[PDB]
C-alpha cells in the first residue's frame, strides 16, 4: 500500500488546530513531512529517523510532530495561521525508494463563511462544431467554489469515462485580486457527432466538493457548504 | 547541502526525447527521480544510486563518482507533463532533499489544425453560454482575459483514444453581454484562419 | 560485583581500499556473540549466511531490491565518499618520530609518537651495519594515532666505539640518525 | 591491501548498552555519545576538517537492538562466552624523571565490551588526568580498548592498571615502575 495520509482535504479555522495522520506498512524507519506552496519546492518541516526520534526541518515553526511507533508520523498544527495554507506531503523510505502519500490540501480561513460549494452547469456542443468536425465537445463549468477542493468526473449512461475528457488541472480565481477569491474550473468531453445525436445517450458532470463536516458550526442563511456532490447533466439532440 | 536541477523549463512536441539533468553536492547522495503529475501526485520513477536503470520509455544514468544523474525520456507523451524532481539523502543526516525541479510540457502534435470558436449553450436555460476555442495547434497560446469580469481557462489536451486523435481547446465565458464569441479571444494571438460561427 | 548471561550483536561495515581508491571493497558483517552469521561483500554482490543462524537474514535481505541496490552502490556513495572526506587527515597524516638511545650488556633504540605505522629501524657500529641479534618488540599502536616500538642490540661495548641508530619513516624525506658512545 | 575504514556498531542486551563508532586502520575517528547524542571526535582537529550529522547512526543502534533481541530468541538464548583481556601497560615517551609523560593501559583481545578500569598510584586510586578510548573492533570480533593516565615520573611510585572483567576471576593488576 505504500504511504497513506489523511485528510486529503481540510478546511481549518484561524487559531484552531488539527492533526494529519501518516501511516506506512513497509517498515520504514525514515519518515518526513513536507509542505509545498503551489508552483514551488517541497520544503521540509520535520523528519524522523526511527521510533521516538524527531528533528526540525527547514521550516518547523507552528508545527509539531511525534513518533512513538515506526508506522505512524502524525503532524500537528497548533495554531492555524494563514501562512499555513499549503499542500502537505508525507514520505517514507529506508534503503532506497522514496514514497509519498497522496497529499493533504489544507486551507486556513478567517471564518467558515469564506467557504462555498460549486455551482455546476453543462453546455451542449454547437451545431456549428458538429457540422464542421463531425465531432461534439461538451463543457462543464464548476463556478463559485472555495476551497479549491474538487474532483470533477464525467459519466455516460451511468459509467465513468476517461477517453475524451480534459479538465483544467489548475482552477482559476473568479477574482485574481481578492485573497480568498472564489474559484471556477472547466472540463471537456468530446465525442463523435453520431454519439451525441443519439438521444438514448446520457451525460453527467459530477463534481465532488470537500467542504465542512458534521461538526463545524454553521450560522448563515445559505445552506451549509458540506462535503457534497453537485451535478448537471444532458441528453442527445438528434437535431 | 544541495541539489541543482538543470533545465528549469522544457517544452517539446510529443514523440521527442528529453534529457533532464541534476548535479548534487558531496553532502548528499543516493539519488532518486520523481514525477509530479499536474494534479500534484508524487510518483517515484527510479531509485538510481549508480549506473543505468531503464523502465519502458524512461532510463536514468547516475555517475555516482561525479555527482550527476541524467533522466532520459523517449517518445515523450503529453501525459508525461508536470514537474520532475531529483531527490537525494544528506549523508549521515538522513534528510530526503529536493532540487528545484524542471517543468515539463509535452505538446500534442496536431496534424490537421482546424482552429475555431463555437458557442455552446447551457442545457438548462438558453441565456447562459460558453465559448470554445478548439483545434488550434500546439503553437497557439491563450492569454488570461484583459476584461477580468471575463474568464479564459488555459488550453488543455484531450485524447479521443477511439480515433487516436488529440485536440487542444480553451474555454471563455462571462455574464456581461458585450462579451461574444466573435471577440472572446482577441486577447490571445489566434491562428490566421480560425472558423467563426453565426 | 557479580552478574549474569550476556548477549551481543555487532554490525561493522568495512571499506577496504587498494591503490588509492582504484579498487574498493565493502564488507558488511553481522556478529552475534562472536559468531559472524551473515555478510554482504560487494565482490559477491549479495548476502550470504556465514552460518545457519544467519541463513534467514540472507534470504530476506536478498529478497529486497533497494537494500541490494543500495549496498551495491555503497562502494562509491559510501566508501569512496568517506575516503574523500577523510583522506587529508587520515591517509595523509604525518607525525614524525622522536628517538632516543640508552642501555637498560644491552642497547635501546626507542622510537615514539609517530604516524603511519610503517617504519624501519636499523643498527650501526662505526658505519658497518649490524644484523645479528637485533631484538625488536615489534610495532605498537597507542590508541591516539601515534605508534611506538623498541629495538635492542645485544653488544657489550668497548671504549671509543660509536653505535648509531638509523630510523626511516615517510614523514621525513631524510633518515633520522641518533648516536651513542661508551 | 592499503586502507580500511570500519563503521562499527554493537548493542549489548542486558546492560542495555550501545556504541556507534568509525575506525580507520584501527584508530577511532569519532564515536557518538549515546547519552549526549552528539559527535565526539577522537582528536579536536577532526572536527575542524570534517563534520558529521548523527541522526541516522542513532537509529542504527535502535535497529541493532531490535535485531539483537530477535537473535537472542532464535539462537535459543545462547549467551556469549567471556574472553579475558590481555592487559599490557607502557609509557608514552622515554620516561625521564620529573618530565610530564603518559601511561597507556592496553586492553586487548576481549569480549563483552564491559571493563572497570582503575589506576593505582602506590595502591591508592587516582582519577585526575584520566581519559580513555571507547570499544574498538578487531577482525576476530573481540574488542580493543585504551586508558591514559598522565603523570610526573618519580623514583618513588609504583602504578598499577587495575582492569576487571568477567573473564578473569580476579582483577588483573599490571605493575609499572620506572626501571
Amino acid at each position: 500500500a505504500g504511504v497513506t495520509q489523511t485528510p486529503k482535504f481540510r478546511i481549518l479555522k484561524i487559531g484552531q488546530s488539527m492533526t494529519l495522520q501518516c501511516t506506512q506498512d513497509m517498515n520504514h524507519n525514515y519518515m518526513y513531512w513536507y509542505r509545498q506552496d503551489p508552483g514551488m519546492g517541497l520544503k521540509l518541516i520535520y523528519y524522523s529517523v526511527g521510533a521516538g526520534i524527531t528533528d526540525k526541518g527547514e521550516v518547523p515553526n507552528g508545527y509539531n510532530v511525534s513518533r512513538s511507533t515506526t508506522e505512524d508520523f502524525p503532524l500537528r498544527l497548533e495554531l492555524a495561521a494563514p501562512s499555513q495554507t499549503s499542500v502537505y506531503f508525507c514520505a517514507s523510505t529506508y534503503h532506497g525508494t522514496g514514497y509519498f502519500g497522496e497529499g493533504s490540501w489544507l486551507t486556513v480561513v478567517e471564518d467558515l463563511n469564506k467557504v462555498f460549494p460549486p455551482e455546476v452547469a453543462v453546455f451542449e456542443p454547437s451545431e456549428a462544431e458538429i457540422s464542421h468536425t463531425q465531432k461534439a465537445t461538451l463543457v462543464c463549468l464548476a463556478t463559485g467554489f472555495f476551497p479549491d477542493h474538487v474532483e470533477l468526473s464525467w459519466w455516460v449512461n451511468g459509467k465513468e469515462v476517461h477517453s475524451g475528457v480534459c479538465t483544467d488541472p489548475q482552477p482559476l480565481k473568479e477574482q485574481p485580486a481578492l485573497n480568498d477569491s472564489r474559484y471556477a474550473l472547466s472540463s471537456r468531453l468530446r465525442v463523435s457527432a453520431t454519439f451525441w445525436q443519439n438521444p438514448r445517450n446520457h451525460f453527467r458532470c459530477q463534481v465532488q466538493f470537500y467542504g465542512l463536516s458534521e461538526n463545524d458550526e454553521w450560522t448563515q442563511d445559505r445552506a451549509k457548504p458540506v462535503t457534497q456532490i453537485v451535478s448537471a447533466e444532458a441528453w442527445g439532440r438528434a437535431d | 547541502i544541495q541539489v541543482e536541477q538543470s533545465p528549469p523549463d522544457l517544452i517539446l512536441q510529443e514523440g521527442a526525447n528529453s534529457t533532464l539533468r541534476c548535479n548534487f553536492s558531496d553532502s548528499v547522495n543516493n539519488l532518486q527521480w520523481f514525477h509530479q503529475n499536474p494534479w500534484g501526485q508524487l510518483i517515484n520513477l527510479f531509485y538510481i544510486p549508480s549506473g543505468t536503470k531503464q523502465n519502458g520509455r524512461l532510463s536514468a544514468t547516475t555517475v555516482a563518482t561525479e555527482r550527476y544523474s541524467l533522466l532520459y525520456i523517449s517518445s515523450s507523451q503529453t501525459t508525461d507533463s508536470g514537474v520532475y524532481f531529483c531527490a537525494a539523502l544528506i549523508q549521515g543526516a538522513q534528510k530526503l532533499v529536493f532540487g528545484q525541479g524542471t517543468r515539463l510540457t509535452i505538446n500534442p502534435n496536431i496534424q490537421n489544425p482546424d482552429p475555431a470558436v463555437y458557442q455552446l449553450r447551457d442545457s438548462k436555460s438558453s441565456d447562459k453560454s460558453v465559448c470554445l476555442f478548439t483545434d488550434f495547434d500546439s503553437q497557439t497560446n491563450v492569454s488570461q482575459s484583459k476584461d477580468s469580469d471575463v474568464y479564459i481557462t488555459d488550453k488543455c489536451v484531450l485524447d479521443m483514444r477511439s480515433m487516436d486523435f488529440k485536440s487542444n481547446s480553451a474555454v471563455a465565458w462571462s455574464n456581461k453581454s458585450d462579451f461574444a464569441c466573435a471577440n472572446a479571444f482577441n486577447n490571445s494571438i489566434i491562428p490566421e484562419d480560425t472558423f467563426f460561427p453565426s | 560485583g557479580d552478574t549474569r548471561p550476556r548477549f551481543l550483536w555487532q554490525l561493522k561495515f568495512e571499506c577496504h581500499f587498494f591503490n588509492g581508491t582504484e579498487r574498493v571493497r565493502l564488507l558488511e558483517r553481522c556478529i552475534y556473540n562472536q559468531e559472524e552469521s551473515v555478510r554482504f561483500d560487494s565482490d559477491v554482490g549479495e548476502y550470504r549466511a556465514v552460518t545457519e543462524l544467519g541463513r534467514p537474514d540472507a534470504e530476506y535481505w536478498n529478497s529486497q531490491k533497494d537494500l541490494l541496490e543500495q549496498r551495491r552502490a555503497a562502494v562509491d556513495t559510501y566508501c569512496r565518499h568517506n575516503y574523500g572526506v577523510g583522506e587529508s587527515f587520515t591517509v595523509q597524516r604525518r607525525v614524525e618520530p622522536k628517538v632516543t638511545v640508552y642501555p637498560s650488556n644491552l642497547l635501546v633504540c626507542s622510537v615514539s609518537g609517530f604516524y603511519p605505522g610503517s617504519i624501519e629501524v636499523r643498527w650501526f657500529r662505526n658505519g658497518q651495519e649490524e644484523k645479528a641479534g637485533v631484538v625488536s618488540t615489534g610495532l605498537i599502536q597507542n590508541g591516539d594515532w601515534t605508534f611506538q616500538t623498541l629495538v635492542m642490540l645485544e653488544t657489550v661495548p668497548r671504549s671509543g666505539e660509536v653505535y648509531t641508530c638509523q630510523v626511516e619513516h615517510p614523514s621525513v624525506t631524510s633518515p633520522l640518525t641518533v648516536e651513542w658512545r661508551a | 591491501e592499503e586502507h580500511v575504514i570500519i563503521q562499527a556498531e554493537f548493542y549489548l542486551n542486558p546492560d542495555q548498552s550501545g556504541e556507534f563508532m568509525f575506525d580507520f586502520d584501527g584508530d577511532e575517528i569519532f564515536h557518538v555519545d549515546m547519552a549526549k547524542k552528539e559527535t565526539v571526535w577522537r582528536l579536536e582537529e577532526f572536527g575542524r576538517f570534517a563534520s558529521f550529522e548523527a541522526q541516522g547512526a542513532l537509529a542504527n543502534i535502535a535497529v541493532d537492538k531490535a535485531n539483537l533481541e530477535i537473535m537472542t530468541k532464535r539462537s535459543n538464548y545462547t549467551p556469549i562466552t567471556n574472553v579475558p583481556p590481555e592487559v599490557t601497560v607502557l609509557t608514552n615517551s622515554p620516561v625521564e624523571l620529573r618530565e610530564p609523560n603518559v601511561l597507556i593501559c592496553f586492553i586487548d583481545k576481549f569480549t563483552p565490551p564491559v571493563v572497570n578500569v582503575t589506576w593505582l598510584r602506590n595502591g591508592k586510586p587516582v582519577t585526575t588526568g584520566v581519559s580513555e578510548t571507547v570499544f574498538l573492533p578487531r577482525e576476530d570480533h573481540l574488542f580493543r580498548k585504551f586508558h591514559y593516565l598522565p603523570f610526573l615520573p618519580s623514583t618513588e611510585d609504583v602504578y598499577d592498571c587495575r582492569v576487571e572483567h568477567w573473564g578473569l576471576d580476579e582483577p588483573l593488576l599490571k605493575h609499572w615502575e620506572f626501571d
Partner: peptide, 15 residues
Amino acid sequence: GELIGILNAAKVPAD
C-alpha cells in the same frame, strides 16, 4: 567540513 556518510542497518525479519 564535509559530512561523513553512514550505511543503515538492515532489519532482521520479524519473529
